[PDB]
Amino acid sequence: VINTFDGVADYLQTYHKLPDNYITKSEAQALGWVASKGNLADVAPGKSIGGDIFSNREGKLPGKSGRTWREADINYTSGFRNCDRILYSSDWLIYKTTDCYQTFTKIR
Template identity: 40%
Template sequence: MRPPKVGDTIIICSFGKTEKGARIEKGILEGVASREEQATSSPVRKNYRKAKKSKIAVIVAICIALAFAFDIYVVYTTPEDAPRNKKACLLKENPAEKEYSSRLHVAKYICDNDHLPVYYVTKSEGIKLYEQKTGKTFVKWNFNPHTTLGVMIGGDYFDNREGRLPPAYYYEADVDYFGDNRGTNRLVYSSGCNIYYTTDHYKTFSKIVFEKQP
């Protein structure tokens, strides 16, 4: 049972000293409404709440529209990367965006920033992501990481054991993902825009050089 509010109909029973029975009177409860009652009954408050809900709905709709318009990517952080807070930005599975994996696009990014784009992950990170996404145990790289996982493989150390490149501390990165697996095309690079390209899995190399802008 709720407590009485202003405006409720009430029945009052009173007993007088000279009266034999109870006197029953009917009336309306008067007084000042509580803050809660004023808030729920006020037209201004009701209109304010409606306007607020409408505003939130409009903001949500705008955010969704912007997400589709600007192709916002989903970002994953793997447990191994937590100390470094490195994030892997997943590429969209869209054939029109092959430039994200092309050798010149990636090489130019390395030359300008001295590191790989954020959608690259190391081999160990790629294996863990594969097992998490597919529920299968990794056996070998018989799949395309771009189309299967939305990432590219790169950032592992390249030891240059055959000595085909000048002495330096090199890293490697996959490029040109157009087949059903990782393929054999790689960039091998070190600091200072020192970048080489191989199409035969490290047997031969060609140096990539970008002209400096005046």
Template identity: 35%
Template sequence: MNTMFSLKMALALITLSATLQVHAALKTCEEEIKETNTFLTGQGAVPVNDITDLATTLRTIKNFGRLPDRYITTEEAKRLGWSGKDSESLWGLKPTNKKWVGGDRYSHPSLPTPQTWLSADIDVAKGHRSPKHVIYSFSGQQRYITTDNYQHLVELAPCQ
């Protein structure tokens, strides 16, 4: 019995050690976004403006399996009175004030299947939807961003 306990403890320590090494190897989300912005700028693409906000969104998805509370789906926004037109700000209506669109299903031929992919706006200004989005799945750690309304997807490395 004592040998079995020792074996289980050794296995637990190895697992914990491996987990800590992987966690320590991950960049912060801010570092990953800055590197991605450097890549985007080098490609002549628009970078992400609010690095801190996107980092918070990525952490919330990773740690809690959901978007931050400010997000509502397009369907929810329309149910609350938003027309869905690009020219109309979500912030023009009291029920959608300070909300951003996120959580809608998204598909693209270059995304891995059979995961369900979702999209959320980033860099929202005055309630108007942005051409910048984060694409994510709750069934894996892969995340992508687009800053040109889904024309090009750039994969983000897992971050903490």
């Protein structure tokens, strides 16, 4: 499993998709993931949440017409999700957050 900021960042720029250990929230939900119980590791062992569209509502990430932002969890192993996320755009800009989307800094 590739779940580090560098690991995932390098993977995305080359293969243009997340590593296989990622599943979207709806996917996770379909497998019986219950957010309030922090049971992801139980229902989807070795998987992390990733690949969902990130709105960029507050315009904190560089916008563009036709640019889509997606996110993925970083450093997750089990229990409740953390506040680590990687943010990647359709034109492969990569940003990070370690505070639940409060602040972003470029990594690629």
